[PDB]
Design a protein around this nucleic acid. Structure first.
Ligand SMILES: [Mg+2]
Ligand SMILES: [Zn+2]
Ligand SMILES: [Zn+2]
Ligand SMILES: [Zn+2]
Lengths: 473, 49, 44, 257, 41, 115, 8, 67, 97, 528
RNA sequence: CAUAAAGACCAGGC
């Protein structure tokens, strides 16, 4: 405890019945910290809290908390001789005593989740395969990934225009930096069945928000070429290939190449257009110049010229393109509610309310009951409370101090119905709609998978050489 | 050299020094650089000896 | 053409078939100058 | 077999919203002018950008996206500009466009905000809304921006940078005398702001001889047009569509045989 | 001296001090430093 | 790639008509009006005005696919009264409606100012 | 997740 | 990155209200009252400016390619 | 070489080696990166159908998260660790003895 | 070696002679489009501009084909090759050589894919013969494949990022054999289990139920509106059910215009009580149940998936058996269109007023949970006093856990009934479980009352430590709390030592789906 | 028009 001889990473297991003592100093073990309990009270007094909120000018931190003997590292083998109390305020009092000899205590029982599962609001209300679905889907939500995305020359980076931090946030997104670099936009969702184009996991989405930047993004891919000398009479050089000197000169439009053989940044480049002009001399030349892909129509961002490890000339062209969301693209919630876009209506066609707030996104009701994602509904109620009161709501898992009746009592005061429902009108005929539609703001993510990266056709193209059947991919 | 470790040219700096070198102050480190790309070692499980 | 250095950001003209280095800093990353044909966008 | 006589009463009037009420008309007419307030009112916005030198942080068409969404004062002279497809001139003219120009160079140590104050036009009647400051881009010591934007004419069915309004509020029948919606428990729903019920009631009593009348509006505005000239231009626009159908219709059954 | 029922700030404040000192990738950095300081010798 | 522009909704193409008349064969004295480059804003108007005529039996409209831009209106009347006559009289009824509403609104907006 | 006779 | 001019749902111009919001937060005001003194009354003009991440102030920490 | 290509061995024995160590860092979103730098892996082959190494276990309380694991044929083998789980680093037993 | 080159999967016989890369084949994403027939699919215009169809030239289409030659690969409805009687192939793409665009009988123009061609559509894995059916082409602007909603259930599709292939028939005999053998109207009933594969199941099924009560009285306006969407309509307006005080129709009187011909059917509905048909009121049914569709018109009864879905003897089945397939196609179409267009008048949702119960259902839910826990304490206290006699076929552990699982499994169905009898008529969970479009009666019980009890390896949560389950409990504890009985619901939230167990159960249920597909897909190859 | 090889491993989508 108080660190005389023994470094704090050992484990000392005594099994009483087996009559032996095991002491491990070996590497590779996994462990987590806990709070020591004495006779029945803890050891972490308030004297350790009032000088711990003062870390910037006191020099008191976690190592003075370990070296004082009030926390302690426990690993997995030593968690079989332990007697944990999960919370001090409810399990170490004088009641009908379950156990009376606790030896440790947890910090907070929501520290058992990882990085991608600490971005789910209310995980104790969801069906656990849905938590497993979103714990592998916030790994492909387009956002901002690092602050120096200008300098870096990566292949295939997606960057979103206007991100926003969530309105319903867990208390452990302050620690993995999600409000500095978020991925997704608080959107006004409506769980309602409207035209039929949002059946079987789809989304109706507002076109007049797409015209104002809703879920818009940019896509950078890079290109490398590298001149080289492969023979005694063979050499590759950055030169603009002309017609009667070089041999293979097809329908690509070579005129945008500069004197250096490299396209200058700024000009727009359609399909099958040469971006790097390099040629090799013939054993009087034949070209080995690179194209783009098929049907992109992007703009060159910057061109970087250098010399590599060997000492040859070496270039990198980064190309950007802007991608507006359309009716094949794939969006997702924070609760395993994936689904594409079905169709886009304007603002004169979406169902409005008594003050003219059309939804951004309409999703089907049938996605709720069979898979039991009702963390979605509580963040869609808590979001409506939080956008009106002016705070940002708490969604940390094991509160027992945030109920649906407390959220409903708060929403009852701001002029709204206490269960989220509102009276929508129709946009095509202006009449009311007989049911009351659950409306509210939730946090959707835009996922990586688009439909311009997946469309494909074929009629009489290239064949393989060995068996003379069409190509692969 | 694993980045941000004690034998790196970025350990113990402040934010203006990291931004001056065109590095991100948030980027946690823990990865190598071999021929331009960025590798990361996955911790492999093992039975105890 | 005319290239801009990557450390001191001074403009220098690197001719073809020549090593790529700057002057009074000793640095080997050049960035291409922006083009001068003009591209027309839409605000849509 | 003929019309009705609607009557308008104006409850409030500011330079940001018009509350008014239309008695004695159909729901199709109140909806159709609720949809022409939004889409089919012409207005001026930027639709052509040519960037000459951009060394800022945002890329080129990010900035050319943020310039289309600045509202330009479109009050008197949107009935006098042609559409660009109606005008038989060359690729541009000053009868269907308005030339702008921005040119901001940063020299000082402090960052410089590039607002909509920097947009300098040629005609002083279509200007961005200044008389706060719509931010375009922030700059650093040693970054610049210069461009040449034009400004076409169109309405909100092309692109929603041409809609003149914020949210158009619209309601009728504040207490269900007609029972278009049906509440499950009518003691949980707060009463509408245009209601006439007692302190301890929920709904008006049903009548089978009902009809939706006495519609209630609220037309906000973003800053381009006056809040009371979206309405007059909407009514004249819808009237012009109907008159075009009667023209080509009467030419059709005139030229049927 | 006891901390009764003010626990909701004390628990997240000791989690705050933990994550302020160590961080999220301390396993990688600490294992590689134990390699290059003792193991090659 | 395949995203069309936004002027395929209200610009007429070169060759196609705004309106088309063809006689319906199931019931005598019925007709079917096909409007190109139009939407709900006007079709709901002409439907709800044709249902104020005492000599109109059937009146409806539909948009057969919303990604297209076209609307269809069906009118069935009595004997001794043509359906396109009811259609034109509905449109002139709407013109007189909107002109009266325009005059009343500008008188009202002149009256709301200056007290 | 329901019971022994149901599903997990 | 930068504040959106012209809110996605309504169209009310929020993109001139950001520095005023920082000035109102700096003195003594709560977030809901600083949203109330700007004329932002319905919640699809309050998630814009209540939940904005201002990333243009950290992309201006790097020296330009032409000093 | 054996950092550059994955195959944790020699070049001339490039088929008797345990691949899949030292793979390319992932850069879509910042939490993709923070998850990829905190990831465990078990070397049981990924076509076998014995479900006992793939289930969640009582000893993973607080050290490996229960929710985050892939889909497909790799369920329950690839594991991501918790928030306060510190994998040890080692010491020499010489003072304790 | 030459053995490894002629060996199994992706060899020269399992990879280049049976299954091979083919051309004239497209692949993109599917999205819904309820305005299409069953017989149709909507192709984007870029795929339709790349694929072709070799069409011969006869003197009945020479003018339309010289029109199709004079525009080509700049305008879309054109061509890209002219193929001669010599077999020579001249192109229209690049350098069209405009002195040689003349056609003659015997030559063939290679036309672009237009509206109304016959194709073949496909989703993989193709587990039976309904999974590759011949659609028909209609061309739509944006960039996905678009198919009708009822065709989802054969292909086992869903519209969250699937992709589906289409192969285009080239010769004229193969387009004729796909037209007369494998069109999607010709494959409504299956030979596997002699019932139909396609039923009216999604949002249109909940609204088909709510369109056919006795409350649904339509006024004159939406009778005009809904009758605008019938392609199989007479031209006559039916005289209403109520003529004074004002004309009102009913839902069954508009629905009885959809039902074709003169077909006869008698079914029931899911809330038909068992003790009704015995005594009186058997041919009135005060809950309006026992569907009778007599001489082609719905006299009485609430419709649901028992009458329109995929069973044997349903209304779509009888209409298939008596009238044909060209009329059953129109039947599916007209149901989906008119019920969607009424459904935007009625509307539908799910909130959390649809997921909460009153303050006297919660009290006896906790009373019966307290009863279950006390009785389990009595059984465990009885077994520790060495007083529990075993049963024939069981050990002491087996009789113990079998009667504890008996007590706890009999005390979560009670809470399930307390949740089921405490819903309402305006509820939306109940309006989905009844209509048969989605949901089940254990989801209402887990959302509202009790999640249940988890179990890995077919038994209650095991002692993963020594004599404990987690380090919070005491050694050799056998109560309901210690071993997985989740007594809260999805709305009251879960405690930590309970969310961990629910994660274990959901983990096992995810492993089984992850593993089973290889064994089943191996058996289904070995039989075939 | 013609030419862009091919194998091994890895991370993903339904
Ligand atoms: Mg699917
Ligand atoms: Zn330099
Ligand atoms: Zn002009
Ligand atoms: Zn708004």
């Amino acid at each position: 405890r108080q660190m005389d001889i023994i470094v704090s990473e050992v484990s000392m297991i005594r099994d009483i019945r087996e009559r032996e003592i095991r002491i491990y100093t070996d590497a590779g073990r996994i462990c987590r910290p806990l709070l020591i309990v004495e006779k029945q009270k803890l050891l972490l007094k308030k004297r350790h809290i009032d000088q711990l909120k003062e870390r910037e000018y006191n020099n008191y931190s976690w190592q003075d908390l370990v070296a004082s003997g009030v926390v302690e590292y426990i690993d997995t083998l030593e968690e079989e001789t332990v007697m944990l109390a999960m919370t001090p305020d409810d399990l170490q009092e004088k009641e009908v005593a379950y156990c009376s000899t606790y030896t440790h205590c947890e910090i907070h029982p929501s520290m058992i989740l990882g990085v991608c599962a600490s971005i789910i609001p209310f995980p104790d209300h969801n069906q656990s395969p849905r938590n497993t679905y979103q714990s592998a889907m916030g790994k492909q939500a387009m956002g901002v990934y690092i602050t120096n995305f200008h300098v870096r020359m990566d292949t295939l980076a997606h960057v979103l225009y206007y991100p926003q931090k969530p309105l319903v946030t867990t208390r452990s997104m302050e620690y993995l930096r999600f409000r500095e670099l978020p991925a997704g936009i608080n959107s006004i969702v409506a769980i309602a069945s409207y035209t039929g184009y949002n059946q079987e996991d789809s989304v109706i989405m507002n076109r007049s928000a797409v015209d104002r930047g809703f879920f818009r993004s940019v896509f950078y891919r890079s290109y490398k070429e590298q001149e080289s000398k492969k023979g005694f009479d063979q050499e590759e050089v950055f030169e603009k290939p002309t017609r009667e000197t070089c041999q293979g000169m097809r329908h690509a439009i070579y005129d945008k190449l500069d004197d250096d053989g490299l396209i200058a940044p700024g000009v727009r480049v359609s399909g099958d257009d040469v971006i790097i002009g390099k040629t090799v001399t013939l054993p009087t030349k034949r070209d080995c110049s690179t194209f783009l892909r098929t049907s992109e129509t992007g703009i060159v961002d910057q061109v970087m010229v250098t010399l590599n490890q060997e000492g040859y000339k070496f270039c990198k062209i980064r190309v950007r393109s802007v991608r507006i969301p359309q009716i094949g693209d794939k969006f997702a919630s924070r609760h395993g509610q994936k689904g594409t876009c079905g169709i886009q209506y304007r603002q004169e066609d979406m169902p409005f309310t008594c003050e003219g707030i059309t939804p951004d996104i309409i999703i089907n009701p049938h996605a709720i009951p069979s898979r039991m994602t009702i963390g979605h509904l509580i963040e869609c109620l808590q979001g409506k409370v939080s956008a009106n009161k002016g705070e940002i709501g708490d969604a940390t898992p094991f509160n027992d101090a945030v109920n649906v009746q407390k959220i409903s009592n708060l929403l009852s005061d701001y002029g709204y119905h206490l269960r989220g429902n509102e009276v929508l009108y129709n946009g095509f005929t202006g009449r009311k709609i007989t049911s009351q539609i659950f409306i509210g703001p939730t946090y959707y993510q835009r996922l990586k998978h688009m439909v311009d990266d997946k469309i494909h056709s074929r009629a009489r193209g290239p064949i393989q050489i060995l068996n003379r059947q069409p190509m692969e991919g | 050299i694993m980045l941000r470790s004690t034998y790196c040219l970025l350990n113990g700096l402040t934010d203006r020094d990291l931004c001056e070198l065109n590095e991100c102050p948030l980027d946690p480190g823990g990865y190598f650089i071999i021929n331009g790309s960025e590798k990361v070692l996955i911790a492999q499980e093992k039975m105890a000896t | 053409m005319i290239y801009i250095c990557g450390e001191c950001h001074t403009e220098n003209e690197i001719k073809s078939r020549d090593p790529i280095r700057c002057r009074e800093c000793g640095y080997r990353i050049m960035y291409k100058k922006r083009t001068k044909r003009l591209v027309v966008f839409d605000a849509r | 077999p003929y019309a009705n006589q609607p009557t308008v009463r104006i409850t409030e009037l500011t330079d940001e919203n018009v509350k008014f009420i239309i008695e004695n008309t159909d729901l199709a007419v109140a909806n159709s002018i609720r949809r022409v307030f939004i889409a089919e009112v012409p207005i001026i916005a930027i639709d052509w950008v040519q960037i000459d030198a951009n060394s800022s942080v945002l890329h080129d068409e990010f900035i050319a996206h943020r310039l289309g969404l600045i509202p330009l004062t479109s009050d008197d002279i949107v009935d006098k500009l042609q559409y660009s497809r109606d005008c038989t001139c060359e690729e541009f003219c000053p009868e269907c466009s308005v030339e702008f120009t921005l040119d901001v160079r940063c020299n000082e140590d402090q960052t410089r905000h590039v607002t909509s104050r920097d947009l300098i036009s040629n005609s002083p009647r279509v200007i961005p809304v200044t008389s706060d400051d719509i931010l375009i881009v922030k700059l650093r010591k040693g970054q610049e921006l210069r461009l040449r934007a034009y400004a076409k004419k169109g309405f909100g069915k092309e692109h929603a940078k041409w809609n003149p309004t914020a949210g158009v509020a619209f309601e009728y029948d504040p207490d269900n005398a007609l029972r278009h919606t049906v509440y499950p428990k009518p003691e949980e729903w707060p009463k509408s702001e245009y209601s006439e019920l007692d302190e301890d009631e929920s709904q008006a009593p049903y009548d089978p001889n009902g009809k939706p009348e006495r519609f209630y509006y609220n037309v906000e505005s973003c800053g381009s047009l006056r809040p009371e000239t979206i309405v007059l231009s909407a009514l004249s626009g819808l009237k012009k569509k109907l008159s075009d159908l009667q023209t080509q219709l009467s030419h059709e059954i005139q030229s049927d045989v | 001296e006891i901390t009764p029922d003010l626990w909701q700030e004390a628990c997240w404040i000791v989690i705050s001090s933990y994550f302020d000192e160590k961080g999220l990738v301390r396993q990688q950095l600490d294992s590689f430093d134990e390699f290059i300081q003792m193991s090659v010798q | 790639m395949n995203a069309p522009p936004a002027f395929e909704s209200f610009l007429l193409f070169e060759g196609e008509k705004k309106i088309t008349i063809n006689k319906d064969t199931k019931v005598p004295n019925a007709c079917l009006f096909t409007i190109n480059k139009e939407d709900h804003t006007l079709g709901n108007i002409i439907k709800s005005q044709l249902l104020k005529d005492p000599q109109v039996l059937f009146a409806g409209y539909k948009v057969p696919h919303p990604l297209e831009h076209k609307i269809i209106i069906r009118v069935q009347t009595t004997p001794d009264y043509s359906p396109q006559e009811a259609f034109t009289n509905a449109i002139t009824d709407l013109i007189s409606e909107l002109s009266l509403l325009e005059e009343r609104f500008r008188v009202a907006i002149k009256d709301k100012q200056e007290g | 997740i329901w019971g022994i006779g149901c599903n997990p | 990155m930068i504040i959106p001019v012209r809110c996605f749902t309504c169209g009310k111009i929020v993109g001139n209200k950001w520095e005023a919001y920082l000035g109102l937060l700096q003195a003594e005001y709560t977030e809901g009252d600083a949203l109330d003194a700007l004329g932002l009354k319905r919640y699809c003009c309050r998630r814009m400016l209540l939940a904005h991440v201002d990333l243009i102030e950290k992309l201006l920490n790097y020296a330009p390619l032409e000093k | 070489y054996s950092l550059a290509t994955g195959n944790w061995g020699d070049q001339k024995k490039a088929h008797q080696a345990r691949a899949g160590v030292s793979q390319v860092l992932n850069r879509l979103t910042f939490a993709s990166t923070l998850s990829h730098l905190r990831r465990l892996n078990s070397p049981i082959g990924r076509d076998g159908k014995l479900a006992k190494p793939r289930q969640l276990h009582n000893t993973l309380w607080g050290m490996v998260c229960p929710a985050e694991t892939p889909e497909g044929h790799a369920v329950g083998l690839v594991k991501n660790l918790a928030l306060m789980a510190y994998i040890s680093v080692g010491s020499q037993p010489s003072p304790i003895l | 070696s030459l053995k490894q080159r002629l060996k199994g999967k992706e060899g020269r016989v399992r990879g280049n002679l049976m299954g091979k890369r083919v051309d004239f084949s497209a692949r993109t994403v599917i999205t819904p489009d309820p305005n299409l027939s069953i017989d149709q699919v909507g192709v984007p215009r870029s795929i339709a501009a790349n694929m072709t169809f070799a069409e011969i030239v006869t003197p009945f289409n020479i003018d339309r084909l010289q029109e199709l030659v004079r525009r080509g690969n700049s305008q879309y409805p054109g061509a890209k090759y002219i193929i001669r009687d010599n077999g020579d192939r001249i192109d229209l793409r690049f350098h069209p050589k405009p002195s040689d665009l003349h056609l003659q009988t015997g030559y063939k123009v290679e036309r672009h894919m237009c509206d109304g061609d016959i194709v073949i559509f496909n989703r993989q894995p193709t587990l039976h013969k309904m999974s590759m059916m011949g659609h028909r082409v209609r061309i739509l602007p944006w960039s996905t494949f678009r198919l009708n909603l009822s065709v989802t259930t054969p292909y086992n599709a869903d519209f969250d990022g699937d992709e589906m292939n289409l192969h285009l028939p080239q010769s004229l005999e193969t387009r004729a054999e796909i037209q007369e053998l494998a069109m999607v109207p010709r494959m409504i009933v299956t030979p596997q289990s002699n019932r139909p594969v396609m039923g009216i199941v999604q949002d249109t099924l909940t609204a088909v139920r709510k369109f056919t009560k006795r409350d649904v009285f339509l006024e004159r306006g939406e009778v005009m509106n809904l009758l605008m969407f019938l392609s199989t309509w007479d031209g006559k307006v039916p005289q209403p059910a109520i003529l004074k005080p004002r004309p009102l129709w009913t839902g069954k009187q508009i629905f009885s215009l959809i039902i074709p011909g003169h077909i006869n059917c008698i079914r029931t509905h899911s809330t038909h009580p068992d003790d009704e048909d015995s005594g009186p009121y058997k041919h009135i049914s005060p809950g309006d149940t026992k569907v009778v569709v007599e001489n082609g018109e719905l006299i009485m009864g609430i419709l649901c998936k028992k009458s329109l879905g995929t069973s044997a003897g349903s209304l779509v089945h009888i209409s298939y058996l008596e009238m044909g397939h060209d009329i059953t196609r129109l039947f599916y179409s007209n149901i989906q269109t008119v019920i969607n267009n009424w459904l935007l008048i009625e509307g539908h949702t799910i909130g959390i007023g649809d997921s909460i119960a009153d303050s006297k259902t919660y009290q006896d839910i906790q009373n019966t949970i307290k009863k279950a826990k006390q009785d389990v304490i009595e059984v465990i206290e009885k077994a520790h006093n060495n007083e529990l006699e075993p049963t024939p076929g069981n050990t002491l552990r087996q009789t113990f856990e079998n009667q504890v699982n008996r007590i706890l499994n009999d005390a979560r169905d009670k809470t399930g009934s307390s949740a089921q009898k405490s819903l309402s008529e305006y509820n939306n969970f109940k309006s989905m479980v009844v209509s048969g479009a989605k949901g089940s009666k254990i989801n209402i019980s887990q959302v509202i009352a009790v999640v249940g009890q988890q179990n890995v390896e077919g038994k209650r949560i095991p002692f993963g430590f020594k004599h404990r389950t987690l380090p919070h409990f005491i050694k050799d504890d056998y109560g309901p709390e210690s071993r997985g009985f989740v007594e809260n619901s999805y709305l009251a939230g879960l405690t930590p030592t309970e969310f961990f167990f629910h994660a274990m159960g959901g983990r096992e249920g995810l492993i089984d789906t992850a593993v089973k597909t290889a064994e089943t897909g191996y058996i289904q190859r070995r039989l075939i």
